[PDB]
Write a protein that binds this ligand. Structure first.
Ligand code: CLA
Ligand code: CLA
Ligand code: CLA
Ligand code: CLA
Ligand code: CLA
Ligand code: CLA
Ligand code: CLA
Ligand code: CLA
Ligand code: CLA
Ligand SMILES: CCCCCCCCCCCCCCCC(=O)OC[C@H](COP(=O)(O)OC[C@@H](O)CO)OC(=O)CCCCCCCCCCCCCCC
Lengths: 162, 41, 172, 160, 168
């Protein structure tokens, strides 16, 4: 496949990693009696470990000669779950914070003491604003084609140079 | 107790409560849906 | 000047309360607000009145009829540890804590910012025992409540001690 | 003070040794009487129950579809624990609809019980004699007052 | 002065002209947030619950042709997939933008002097049209109460199955 990689369910070296990770925890398990808390903890760890290899095998990830999963970010839609889909997710949450935080500064600006409300949050007002950023791509778009997103060039102070 | 409420609204107290709620958010999701390298789950 | 301890001065804060007696040698009344201290003694008494009788009915022999199978062959000393393994004590803790989060709102509104609510009155009189009563009868009932509340705090305190020492029949 | 009320019959008259309607409140008598009349007849149906049951008179047939018959049922407190689990539910249900339907008759404490023609049967309050009801309601209370001591016998003369 | 519902904390201010008013706000949310938003929330939470209480029960016995009968309502999304689920919620969105003429946030909603809480304009049959005020207040008390019963209900129906593994 891409870059001469093989899928992880068919990699001979990915399977060896699964065995040696389980063998290491089994040889630690043998020094304890079967009902005790260290034996139940290591038994639960080998279940977590065994479920970690099974998950990847059917995942659809690509392995190398090293036996480790690789990620593809060319833009292929077949490997979307690797970068695109968690990427769109992060953009939604990061742009949500920046939008909401900016709404707050603009709101408390027209006031006697704007600086007072940055060290001591008006929580009822802040709480209201935080959840209005769920539709930010629409709200950031309405202000771009209004004139309320970016200011004019005669409103920004500039260094003597330019 | 309107002065304790203004004390609970100061920036470092709100930052630790917000982070405590948000670290524990990520810890809980990693407790039920662990080892999620990608969407494959 | 104290009626309980006639070789002491009067503690200068206990005035106006239903139970007076001049009894405060360690003087907590000059330290804590005196509405808040009466809250406790009412709440401490009301738990112990239910805790004494409730701790005994189960040892004189009286159990609930449906019997979940988890409440089988248990005395009251053992009935704490097996129950928290069941979920009964995790529940009663929940519905008590629901009532206590409301009571936290009430006690801060009374001590500070002036609710006007009495230390231990929750408006709970369904059968109307005090309605229509004058101040000579309301002050008597409230007085009777603390006395039995005071008696049951010391009564329950011994019997959980008495039961773990001599593990047996209800009389210990 | 609180005389010439319902059911103060003389073999005694004014049965108050310890001040219980006076030191109750203004009105607990209005609770207490509603409270007493219900206790009297649950005892009556307990006494008329536990006696007619003890004579062996049973309903002919089965109590469920799985073949449990009424004649397989002895008495005492050993008969409530025998009628099956679902069979106890439908007992308690259209009883529990009717402490709801009778306590809430637009007045709680003025009128007494909320008479037995609440469901399936219909009552007339208009035919209402002043003299006739004083004796008949005071028989009825005092039948139950003896029946409570009578059922307290046969509940306690089982354990000893 | 004191609350009608719980008579040992102070009566909540700025909840007076509302339908299910019994003065129940011990945590004081109506002191901090706009009351029109809170009412509109409570009605909407109630209407979605009342539809989900019918749904959870009727889905066991009726199933439309083409789908797979699932013993427990809770396991239904797995038996319908994700594409069908997203179609539902994205159309719910489109039904919600048209609903409030585009004013969908806690700052844009209730910006008109009209637009009272819960009035959708929805009335195809004509229930409560041209009647008096007392009757209108009475029918609005029924929608709140049945919606509040259904919220605590739809918990229990969903929760019962969480522990156990079989239908209602
Ligand atoms: C002997 C104890 C006693 C006394 C004198 C009072 C007295 C009072 N309480 Mg109080 N209370 C008690 C115990 C008591 N309480 C307990 C244990 C609790 C916890 C559940 C409470 C919780 C409580 C609340 C939450 C409130 C009161 C209030 C009041 C006042 C008005 C109501 C009233 O008079 O009813 C009391 C009248 C009685 C005749 C007492 C009842 C005696 C019982 C029935 C004895 C029987 C014991 C047991 C149930 C028997 C069962 C059988 C057994 C074999 C299993 C009054 C000053 C209200 C208040 O302060 O308003 C002014 C109020 O808001 N109480
Ligand atoms: C460390 C990593 C990290 C992560 C993962 C997050 C994650 C999040 N932050 Mg945080 N944050 C962080 C660090 C982080 N933060 C840091 C370092 C800071 C600086 C101090 C902040 C500052 C901060 C602020 C101020 C805020 C956040 C908020 C948010 C949330 C925005 C998305 C959301 O609310 O849910 C996603 C919600 C949805 C997708 C809902 C969709 C819209 C609805 C209408 C659709 C309804 C669908 C329906 C219910 C489905 C049911 C249908 C049924 C049939 C199934 C999100 C949980 C915001 C928040 O908490 O929200 C109130 C917020 O205000 N963050
Ligand atoms: C401090 C109070 C208190 C506490 C923490 C407990 C705790 C416990 N009881 Mg107990 N109990 C109490 C008082 C208390 N009881 C009282 C006062 C009685 C006599 C009525 C009983 C009678 C009793 C029985 C018969 C049984 C228990 C049992 C138990 C255990 C399981 C819970 C249960 O089934 O409750 C059952 C509780 C009750 C039937 C009574 C609760 C009454 C509450 C506490 C007071 C009423 C509150 C109300 C506001 C007052 C006004 C109402 C008015 C109409 C009377 C648990 C350890 C069970 C067990 O496992 O035993 C081994 C059991 O079978 N209890
Ligand atoms: C009204 C309260 C009251 C009453 C009547 C009794 C009565 C009695 N206690 Mg007692 N006791 C009480 C409170 C009470 N105690 C308190 C508050 C405590 C704990 C500090 C104790 C701790 C206690 C111990 C440690 C012992 C008694 C013992 C005894 C018995 C002798 C006697 C029946 C003795 C006993 O039961 O021996 C068999 C015994 O050894 N009591
Ligand atoms: C008109 C409504 C109605 C209907 C449909 C029924 C129907 C039924 N009753 Mg019934 N019952 C009714 C009114 C009614 N009852 C009334 C008004 C009373 C008096 C309060 C009772 C008291 C009663 C008892 C005591 C018992 C039943 C039982 C039963 C059921 C037999 C179930 C069985 O064997 O498992 C198939 C049957 C479905 C029996 C039952 O459920 O036992 C399993 C049983 O023991 N019923
Ligand atoms: C502890 C015993 C007790 C007491 C003293 C009362 C007292 C009362 N109940 Mg009641 N009730 C009880 C237990 C009790 N209930 C139980 C266990 C149930 C079953 C859950 C009910 C179900 C019930 C209903 C359904 C109704 C009452 C109503 C009433 C009130 C009638 C007078 C009125 O309208 O007041 C004026 C108002 C104050 C009165 C305050 C009525 C009511 O509240 O109407 C407003 C009514 O219809 N009760
Ligand atoms: C869940 C079942 C149910 C319920 C709650 C009622 C309710 C009622 N029926 Mg009823 N009835 C039912 C089923 C039911 N019916 C069926 C299935 C039949 C037979 C086919 C009857 C035959 C019936 C008769 C013949 C009479 C009632 C009457 C009554 C009323 C008073 C009864 C007390 C009340 C409105 C009586 C009435 O009108 O009294 C006021 C009356 O005469 N019903
Ligand atoms: C604890 C001891 C005790 C005492 C002192 C009494 C005392 C009395 N019993 Mg009694 N009795 C007891 C236990 C006791 N009972 C037990 C265990 C039972 C169950 C068998 C009864 C059942 C009983 C009956 C059936 C009768 C008495 C009667 C009597 C009275 C003669 C007298 C008041 C008589 C009575 O009260 O007259 C009606 C009578 O006929 N006893
Ligand atoms: C806020 C209300 C609320 C409440 C009370 C519950 C309650 C519950 N949900 Mg639930 N749920 C809710 C909201 C809620 N949910 C919401 C909004 C959603 C999303 C829509 C879900 C989704 C959800 C799902 C999908 C499922 C549940 C399940 C459950 C049950 C699991 C119980 C549990 O967590 O063990 C509580 C844990 C304990 C009691 C253990 C504690 C034991 C130790 C000894 C106590 C000491 C440790 C202590 C906690 C530490 C102290 C803290 C520290 C600060 C000091 C329980 C009935 C599931 C279920 O029933 O499975 C079993 C199930 O299928 N719910
Ligand atoms: C398949 C579904 C698509 C059908 C579209 C349905 C149209 C909705 C109806 C429009 C409202 C008309 C009513 C009055 C018309 C009106 O004036 O209201 C327009 C409305 C805002 O209206 P207002 O300006 O009155 O709202 C208050 C503003 O002044 C803000 O203060 O904005 C929209 O129309 C948004 C439409 C949805 C846009 C959907 C595009 C999807 C973008 C999402 C991007 C995802 C990013 C993912 C993260 C990276």
């Amino acid at each position: 496949d891409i870059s001469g990689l093989t899928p992880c369910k068919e990699s001979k070296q990915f399977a060896k990693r699964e065995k040696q990770a389980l063998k290491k925890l089994q040889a630690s398990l043998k020094l304890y009696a079967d009902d005790s808390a260290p034996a139940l903890a290591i038994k639960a760890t080998m279940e977590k470990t065994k479920k970690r290899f099974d998950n990847y095998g059917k995942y659809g990830l690509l392995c190398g000669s090293d036996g480790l999963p690789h990620l593809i970010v060319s833009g292929d839609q077949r490997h979307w779950g690797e970068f695109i889909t968690p990427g769109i997710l992060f953009l939604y949450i990061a742009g949500w914070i920046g939008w909401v935080g900016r709404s707050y500064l603009i709101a408390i600006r027209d006031e006697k003491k704007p600086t007072q409300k940055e060290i001591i949050i008006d929580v009822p007002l802040a709480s209201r604003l935080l959840f209005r950023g769920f539709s930010w791509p629409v709200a950031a778009y309405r202000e771009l084609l209004n004139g309320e997103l970016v200011d004019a060039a005669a409103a920004a102070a500039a260094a003597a140079a330019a | 107790m309107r002065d304790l409420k203004t004390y609970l609204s100061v920036a470092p107290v709100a930052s630790t409560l917000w982070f405590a709620a948000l670290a524990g958010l990520l810890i809980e999701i990693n407790r039920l849906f662990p080892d999620a390298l990608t969407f494959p789950f | 000047k104290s009626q309980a301890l006639p070789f002491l001065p009067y503690p200068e804060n206990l005035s106006g309360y239903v139970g007076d007696a001049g009894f405060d040698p360690f003087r907590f009344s000059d330290f804590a607000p005196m509405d808040f201290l009466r809250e406790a003694e009412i709440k401490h008494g009301r738990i112990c009145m239910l805790a004494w009788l409730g701790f005994v009915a189960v040892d004189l022999g009286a159990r609930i009829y449906p019997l979940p199978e988890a409440y089988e062959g248990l005395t009251s000393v053992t009935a704490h540890d097996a129950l928290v393994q069941q979920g009964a004590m995790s529940q009663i803790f929940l519905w008590c804590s629901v009532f206590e989060a409301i009571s936290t709102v009430s006690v801060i509104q009374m001590l500070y910012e002036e609710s006007g609510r009495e230390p231990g009155n929750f408006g709970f009189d369904p059968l109307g025992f005090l309605k229509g009563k004058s101040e000579a009868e309301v002050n008597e009932m409230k007085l009777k409540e603390i006395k039995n509340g005071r008696l049951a705090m010391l009564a329950f305190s011994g019997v959980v001690t008495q039961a773990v020492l001599t593990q047996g029949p209800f009389p210990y | 003070a609180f005389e010439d009320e319902l059911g103060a019959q003389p073999p005694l008259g004014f049965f108050d040794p310890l001040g219980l309607v006076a030191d109750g409140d203004q009105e607990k008598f209005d609770r207490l009487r509603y409270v007493e009349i219900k206790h009297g007849r649950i005892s009556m149906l307990a006494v008329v129950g536990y006696l007619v049951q003890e004579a062996g008179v049973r309903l002919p047939g089965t109590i469920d579809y799985s073949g449990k018959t009424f004649a397989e049922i002895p008495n005492g407190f050993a008969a409530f624990k025998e009628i099956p689990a679902g069979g106890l539910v439908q007992l308690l249900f259209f009883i529990g609809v009717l402490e709801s339907s009778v306590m809430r008759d637009l007045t709680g404490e003025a009128e007494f019980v909320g008479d037995f023609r609440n469901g399936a049967i219909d009552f007339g309050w208009d035919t209402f004699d002043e003299e006739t009801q004083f004796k008949k309601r005071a028989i009825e209370l005092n039948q139950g007052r003896a029946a409570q001591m009578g059922i307290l016998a046969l509940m306690v003369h089982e354990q000893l | 002065e004191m609350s009608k519902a719980v008579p040992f904390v102070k009566a909540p201010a700025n909840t007076a002209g509302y339908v299910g008013d019994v003065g129940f706000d011990p945590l004081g949310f109506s002191d901090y947030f706009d009351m029109k938003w809170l009412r509109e929330s409570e009605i909407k939470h109630g209407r979605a619950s009342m539809l989900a209480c019918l749904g959870f029960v009727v889905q066991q016995y009726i199933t439309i042709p083409g789908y797979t009968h699932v013993d427990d309502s809770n396991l239904a999304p797995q038996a319908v997939g994700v594409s069908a689920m997203l179609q539902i919620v994205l159309w719910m969105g489109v039904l919600e933008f048209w609903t409030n003429k585009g004013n969908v946030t806690m700052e844009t909603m209730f910006s008109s002097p009209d637009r009272v809480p819960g009035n959708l304009g929805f009335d195809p049959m004509g229930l409560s049209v041209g009647k008096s005020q007392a009757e209108k207040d009475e029918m609005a008390l029924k929608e709140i109460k049945n919606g509040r019963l259904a919220m605590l209900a739809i918990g229990g129906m969903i929760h019962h199955n969480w522990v156990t593994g079989e239908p209602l």
